[PDB]
Structures are given as C-alpha cells and as structure tokens.
C-alpha cells in the first residue's frame, strides 16, 4: 500500500484547531512509509495550542520510528496552572459582581482554555453549567456549535443530534421569517452540516445525504466543522450509493447551488456523470482509484467498503432494469470483471430478490423472468387455507383437552 | 445548445414511431433514425430508465419487446390482500386461548 | 387384532380418543407391523373420554407421541410433525419423560421437512421454556450447524456427538438430516440457474463427483419435488420452471374437496357451540 500522490500540506492548510491534529495522527496510525513528513510537519507546527500529553505521545512514535524536550514542559505546566489560577479568581471576581454577560463571556473564555489544555470533559461541564446564563438566541446558537464541537470531539452523536434539533427549535424555527431573506450570518448552514456529519457517523446514509446536501458554497468559508472538499466529496458518494435515479436527477446533478461544490472536485463530477449517463467501465475505474486516497480520511474510514459495495450493487441492479435478457459477456467486460466473479455476483444477488432474474451458463445469458400473478395467488391462498385448516385442527383438539383438564402428575 | 438540441427531436421520432409497434429490429430504427445501432441502443436505455418508453431490449436478438400487456389483473392483487388479512385473522383467533 | 376390536366397542363414536388408543400404538410399534394402526390414527380426535377418572396425561402424551413414531417410519412427515408439535403443548407444571424425545424427535423431523426450526405454538406451558430447553443442547448444535446450508462442518458435528444420538436409539433420523442439504441446495439452486453443466453445479453443491449429480437429479425427479432434465449430449440440467396452468378441471376438484372438508369443520363447530348454549352451567353466568 504506497501512495505518493497525498498532498500533507493541503491538509495541514485547509483544517485547524484540534482537528489538523487528530487527523495528522490518523493518517500517522494508518498509512505506513509515510510518517516521516506527516511527523516532521506535526513537530513543527503542532508544538503551540499547549501540547502536553499528545507531545509525548507523538515523542513515543518518534522514538519508535528511529536531545530531551523536557524543561519545556513543566515550564508549559506551571504557565498553565498560573492561567488556571488567574482565571480561577478572575470567575469569581465576576461571581461575586454577578453580570449575566461578563459571567457569560468568562465562562466561554475559560471552556476554550480548556479546550486548549485537553479537558474535554471540563469544558462540557462548564458549558452545562453556563448554560444556564442565557438570555439571547444567538449566544444559544453559538455555544451550542461550540458544544456540538466538543460532543463530535467527545463522540457521542445522538446527544449532537438531539442537540442540533433543539438548537433548530430554539429561535422560534427559523425566526419564523427566513432571517430577512436568508441570513448573511448564516449559521444555519453550519449546523445542517453538523447534522449531516453526525448523521454520516450514525450508519444513516440517506439522511445524512439529505441534510448535507442542502448548503450554501458562499456561507461554507468556515473550516472549524468541515471543508469544502471534503463536504462534497461526502455529499457526492452518499447521494450516488442511496439515492435512486429520480433522486440523483433532482437534487445532485441539477441543482445550481451544488454544482459549485461539484466543480470544487471535478474528480466526483465525472463520476457522478458517468454513473447517470450508462457509463460504467471508467465511472468503477476512477472509483478504484480514489479508493486509496479516500481510505486516508478520518471520518470515513470505517465505511469505505459498505460505501462501495452499495454503489456496486446499485450500479448492477440500474444496468440489468433495462434489459430482458443480456449476454453477460459484455456484462462483465463493461464491469470489469471476468465472466466467474460476475456470474458468482449475479447467483449471490438473485437469492436476495432484488434482481428477478436466472442465469443460463452455457451461452451465458442472463433472462429476464415475470411473475404470473395468477399462479402465484393461487398457490399461495391454498397454502394458507391448508395452514388455516391445521391450525383448526389442532386448536379444537386443544379445546377438547382443555374441557377435560389433563395435566401431568 | 445543440448538443441538448438534435437529441430531443430524436428522441419525439423515436417516441412516435414506437407507438403501434410491439417488437422490431435495432437496425430498422437504425435506418430511420440515421445513427449507428450503438446510439440506438443508448437512447433507448435512456428512454427506458426516465420511464418514457415502456418496453424492454433484447441484446441477443437486438428487439425492442413493448408493453402491449397486463391485462385487468387488478382483481388478483385485491385477491391476494384478503390473504394477507386472513391468516393474520386467524392467528388472532386462535390466540385467544383454547 | 384383538386390540381392534376393542376400539369399535367402547368409544361412542370413530373420533372419539381413548387410552386403549396408546395401548394399539405401542403394539403396533412394538411389533413392527405399521399398516393396521394406520386406520385408527389418520381420522382426527375430538373429545377425551374421562372414564371415571383414569384417562391422566399418561395415556394422552403416549399416544401422540407414539404416532409420530408410527408415521416417521412410514415417510409422512406432515401428520408426525402435527403430532409431535401437539404432543410437545400439552399442559403441564412438570418435565417428564417422553417430553424430552418427543421434543428430539420434533426438531430432528422439522429439519427434515422445511429448512428451518419451526416455532412452537404459542399456547404451551412455561415448562418447557426453562428445563427442557437446555437439557437438549446437541440437536440444538445440529439445527443451528443446519441453518449455515453447509453439508462438511455437519458430519463431523455428527460424528462427534454420535454417543448421545446412539444412546437416545434414534440413529436413522439424523443421518436422514445430513442427506437432506444435498435434497435443498438443489432446491435452492434452482431459484437462480435456468440450466446449468454437471461440474460447476456438482462443485456448488460439493457430492464430489458429476456423475452422482445425475444419480440425484434422476431421484428428485423421480420423486417428484423438483421439475428438471437431464440432457447428456453436452452435460446439462435444465430447469423447467413450468408445473401448473391452473385451468384443468382437476384444480377444481382440488377446490371442491377442500371445500367439503371445510364445511364439515363448519358444522362441527357449529354444532359444539349449539351444544354449549344449551348447559344449565351457563345462562347464568352472564
């Protein structure tokens, strides 16, 4: 597994935060031959934001993948606790003032400091306990993104989903308006995504295609949830595995304001009309190839396969529905695949149901069969009138024994 | 635009010509459609999977079986519903207890 | 003999159970002599004579269980599972002993017959749900080695667990359900493949050899559970998925004696619920 075309410095530019480096140690875990540069690029630049206990850590896989940065961190370690100490009094000066905005805005500073720090569960704390000093919508909304951010950090996503809806239900849905015409400060986007992220990490494909489609490129300039690339690279894979073809005509390939995303990433673009347009062949092969690039991403790591194998499904069920009965011989030159695997692909989904067709393996034809209505109605309505007629049988036979009153002894 | 153009014009002939027939060769809408079979063969799986053409191919024998069919079967299906009713019914009654 | 002639003069109508029924089937299946218990057990039993108060579930358990001895030995399976599953409800706050093989015997003949355990009927005593369940824990090992449509892990499970089968005298049920996998994967096989070459399917199926796949396509047709042919020009089975029209008047005649059968039950019914709106014991109860 080699691959030479990854671009570190594109993710180390286009993320930050946390997230840059919980990434960097993903594709450190994860792609081997590499680490070298993902290491020397998370040296150099991950050593602010107060690196303490992933330091040693990165430290560790540094001595393993071969002087002593020591002082350093108890000097970080004392101006941490003397930062604590300063907020510490600075909380209580303003406790003790009792001014709903400054307690407010002293707690959103110290939860970020610990953010900074490491304390997850801290920070979610201090939040719980600051919620309670609300008074407008819009502090609402902004520290529900920041405790949405700490909730994907923490992964628990039906909390960040329940929490999402809420948020959505908080300013009287809406504000009731559409915020004059869409708002400039457009929020909304932000937490459509979230919801969509958390959707995507749930196992719900079709709701998280649904949600994420709906953003805006021109509100999508914030990179503190997601990116743009990375957004329409999910969007696109979702919607082509789950959506059918009504669906991947009415919202991928026709709406306006998602063709930007599309052009953000003209690799997905070709895929996409390849896959509309009864292109098979180049649409699995380009697919292939991004295979490698796309294992590398953090989110979507453990669902690449399932991914994949729904679009391969998909493809097959959409390229034998126009058809009665098909030489599998370009079937499987059009899929790239010899004529066993095709043949074991087609025997392996017909006992599913969902592809109503035989195989005939001496000229290797794949037919097309119909129901008849008639013959399958009558069978069936005589297997249940005879199962009826047991049933009967055997429950009079129990009310017999029951008027009786025989039990063992 | 012209490339949208000279294939919705195709497309109407191919949909007028289709109307009283229920089984033809490819090469003869070939012939009048004035575009090699492969093409042929792609518009009409296009048609077919936007639910415009009702109807079928066949690669083997290149034929375009309609869907001069189904008749009024409807009755069959109500038919079938009372099955998924009645077992169910009885599974009820006998429930109960003895 | 003597025994039937006994049935005829004490019972006060044909379907009438009795504890000398039990008696007639534990000679018959002593004796080895199937066919003159066959009369006396294919007509249903309604009503259990109390007989002054001797007819326990001693003389009820034995007899349907003895049936379903009776009939799986004669290849009904139908009518021996029927009996087995009605001797496994009774109703009892207790484990007794023919419970157990009763229950064997039930999940060794639900094998043979579909392809899956078939669930037990909801009126049946908590009993069985806690002791009988996990005393038996080999023939739940076959069902579930079943269920995986795999016919190499299932002779050594087998084999493995030959002492207690020997030991339970049941030998010739279970070898019975090893050769049932090659009976359903054709079965199976033949949803999916129009027709099909003697290797490729015979390496599917895995007998180990093309030419006994035409020794067992041969049976089944024989047998007739599936419609197919042999054509040995080029190495085929052909499926012909093609039995029935449903237009001669035979299908009608089907109709018709399921019709007769139905209305009797009707007027049985009907009859016994006449019969208890008559009983002093009731019309004062509501």
């Given at each position: ?11 180390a530019?286009?993320?930050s935060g946390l997230?840059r480096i919980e990434?960097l140690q993903?594709?450190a ?7 070298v540069?993902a290491l020397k690029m998370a040296l150099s630049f991950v050593q602010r934001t107060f690196n303490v206990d992933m330091y040693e850590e990165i430290h560790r896989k540094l001595s393993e993948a071969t002087a002593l940065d020591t002082a350093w961190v108890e000097a970080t370690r004392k101006k941490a606790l003397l930062k604590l100490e300063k907020l ?24 970020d400091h610990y953010l900074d720090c490491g304390d997850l569960?801290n ?287 | ?98 | ?286």
């Open positions: 597994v080699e691959n030479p075309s990854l671009d570190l410095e594109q993710y530019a286009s993320y997230m990434r993903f594709i875990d994860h792609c081997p031959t590499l680490r540069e510490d009094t600075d909380l209580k000066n303003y406790k003790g003032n009792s001014i709903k905005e400054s307690i407010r805005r002293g707690h959103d500073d110290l939860g569960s920070a979610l704390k201090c939040y719980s306990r600051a919620r309670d000093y609300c008074t407008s919508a819009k502090h609402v909304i902004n520290m529900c993104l920041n405790v949405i951010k700490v909730s994907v950090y923490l992964q628990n996503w039906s909390h960040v989903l329940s929490y999402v809806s809420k948020a959505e239900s908080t300013p009287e849905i809406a504000e009731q308006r559409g915020e004059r015409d869409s708002q400039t400060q457009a929020i909304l986007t932000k937490l459509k995504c979230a919801a969509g992220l958390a959707e995507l990490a749930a196992r719900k494909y079709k709701q998280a295609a649904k949600c994420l489609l709906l953003a805006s490129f021109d509100h999508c300039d914030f990179p503190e949830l997601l990116s743009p690339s990375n957004v329409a690279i999910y969007g696109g894979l979702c919607a082509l595995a789950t959506f059918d073809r009504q669906e991947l005509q009415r919202n991928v390939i026709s709406s306006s304001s998602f063709k930007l995303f599309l052009e953000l990433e003209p690799q997905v673009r070709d895929i996409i009309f390849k896959f509309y347009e009864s292109k098979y062949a180049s649409c699995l092969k380009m697919l292939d190839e991004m295979k490698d690039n796309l294992l590398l991403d953090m989110y979507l790591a453990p669902h690449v396969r399932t991914l994949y194998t729904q679009i391969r499904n998909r493809a097959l069920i959409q390229y034998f529905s126009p058809y009665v009965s098909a030489d599998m011989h370009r079937m499987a030159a059009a899929f790239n695949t010899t004529v066993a695997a095709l043949e074991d692909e087609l025997t392996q989904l017909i006992l599913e149901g969902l592809i109503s067709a035989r195989v005939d393996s001496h000229s290797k034809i794949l037919y097309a069969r119909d129901v008849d209505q008639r013959s399958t109605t009558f069978e069936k309505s005589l297997l249940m009138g005879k199962e009826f007629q047991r049933r009967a049988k055997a429950m009079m036979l129990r009310a017999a024994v029951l008027r009786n009153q025989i039990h063992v002894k | 635009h012209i490339e949208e153009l000279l294939r919705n014009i195709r497309t109407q002939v191919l949909i007028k010509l289709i109307k009283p027939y229920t089984r033809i060769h490819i090469p003869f809408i070939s012939k009048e459609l004035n575009i090699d079979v492969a093409d042929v063969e792609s518009l009409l799986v296009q048609c077919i999977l936007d639910n415009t053409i009702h109807g079928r191919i066949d690669q083997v024998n290149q034929l375009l079986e309609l869907d001069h069919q189904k008749r009024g079967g409807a009755r069959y299906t109500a038919l079938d519903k009372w099955t998924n009713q009645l077992n169910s019914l009885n599974q009820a009654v006998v429930s109960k207890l003895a | 003999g003597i025994l039937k002639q006994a049935i005829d003069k004490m019972q006060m109508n044909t379907n009438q159970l009795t504890s000398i029924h039990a008696d007639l089937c534990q000679l018959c299946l002593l004796a080895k002599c199937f066919k003159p218990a066959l009369p006396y057990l294919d007509v249903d039993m309604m009503d259990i004579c109390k007989e002054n108060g001797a007819y326990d579930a001693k003389h009820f358990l034995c007899y349907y269980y003895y049936g379903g001895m009776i009939y799986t030995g004669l290849k009904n399976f139908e009518r021996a599972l029927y009996f087995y599953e009605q001797a496994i409800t009774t109703p009892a706050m207790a484990v007794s002993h023919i419970m157990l093989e009763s229950y064997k015997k039930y999940i060794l003949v639900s094998l043979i017959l579909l392809g899956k355990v078939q669930q037990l009927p909801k009126y049946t005593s908590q009993i069985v749900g806690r002791f009988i369940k996990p005393l038996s824990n080999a023939y739940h090992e076959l069902a579930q080695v079943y269920s995986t449509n795999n016919p190499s892990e299932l002779r050594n499970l087998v084999n493995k667990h030959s002492e207690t089968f020997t030991r339970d005298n049941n030998m010739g049920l279970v070898k019975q359900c090893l050769s049932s996998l090659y009976k359903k994967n054709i079965q199976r096989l033949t949803k999916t493949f129009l027709t099909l070459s003697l290797q490729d399917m015979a390496s599917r199926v895995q007998l180990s050899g093309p030419q006994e796949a035409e020794k067992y396509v041969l049976h089944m047709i024989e047998d007739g559970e599936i419609f197919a042919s042999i054509n040995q020009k080029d190495g085929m089975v052909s499926f012909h998925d093609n039995p029935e029209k449903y237009n001669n008047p035979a299908m009608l005649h089907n109709i018709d004696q399921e019709m007769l059968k139905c209305i009797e039950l009707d007027e049985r019914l009907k009859a016994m619920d006449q019969e208890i709106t008559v009983n002093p014991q009731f019309v004062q109860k509501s």
